[PDB]
């Protein structure tokens with residue numbers, strides 16, 4: 432697995448990507464790693480923001496599925512032509528798989544200007560694949576066609592360039608300290624999990640835990656933010672704001688409508704509280720908790736042209752699709768997507784940003800009753 436260490440790159444806020452090759456002879460592409468979706472899709476036309484794109488004409492092994500795909504988010508989208516071809520990961524396992532590939536031929540607010548990636552690898556399950564669950568996800572094909580074990584793990588670091596590791600088929604013990612604690616994957620569609628309790632600085636939000644998961648809680652490497660449902664976010668913010676009364680900031684800041692700034696080397700770590708999410712455990716009435724920091728939910732925006740100060744963005748936000756454990760959470764931890772056992776493991780990351788005031792943690796066991804009631808039907 433040392434071959435795969437440090438095989439992810441990126442820039443702050445623009446996601447983590449891995450090098451992949453498609454077609455024969457191999458075309459090299461940088462591909463976004465995204466556990467919040469399930470299509471393998473790559474740029475296939477010369478959109479001006481793209482360094483590189485898939486040229487199906489150069490590939491002996493390409494096969495057209497003679498079907499299209501239309502994949503919208505909030506305005507919005509990409510649109511493509513389906514096929515299969517041969518696919519490798521240079522700094523991954525030593526195999527080549529025949530995989531479905533959506534050749535992207537039109538898009539809107541998908542590709543990012545200034546970024547170094549040209550596609551997206553959806554690592555979640557067939558249920559959320561487009562246009563339907565019959566389109567076999569890349570990782571399914573990988574596992575089905577080779578002897579790679581059915582799991583992958585992610586260490587997302589981040590510092591400007593970010594870096595990390597996607598270990599495919601296994602676990603690298605150099606990448607974490609202490610023990611892995613596992614929470615069940617509640618359903619194989621997104622990587623759905625259940626939060627059973629939330630503490631800010633070590634204080635419960637006394638909230639019907641069923642809310643914390645309204646209507647979803649998911650682990651998503653493609654999202655920068657820790658994202659909370661309206662009602663939970665409203666209460667979430669209430670306590671973070673009061674935890675941090677020492678100094679004040681605007682209404683918009685908490686709604687991600689304005690960024691906040693301090694001078695270089697003058698930020699208050701400690702005027703902000705820790706977040707602890709207790710996740711459902713492997714055993715009835717047993718949980719564990721993961722604890723992050725404001726360094727994780729306060730992300731230092733590199734270069735605003737309108738300031739030379741140290742400006743950070745509030746990384747927590749609302750949703751109607753639900754909770755989203757994104758880069759804010761995942762950068763604190765080594766995270767193991769144990770598909771074979773339907774569970775996701777969290778351990779303290781060997782690369783997380785710490786000191787000797789406070790530190791990221793994964794602790795258990797705790798006793799939590801009615802953790803099923805936290806799940807939404």
Ligand SMILES: Fc1ccc(CC2CCNCC2)cc1
Pocket residue numbers: 465466467468504540541542543551651652653654
């Ligand atoms: F710039 C973008 C836009 C949209 C996406 C797809 C999302 C899938 C769910 N996880 C977050 C990303 C990626 C990049």
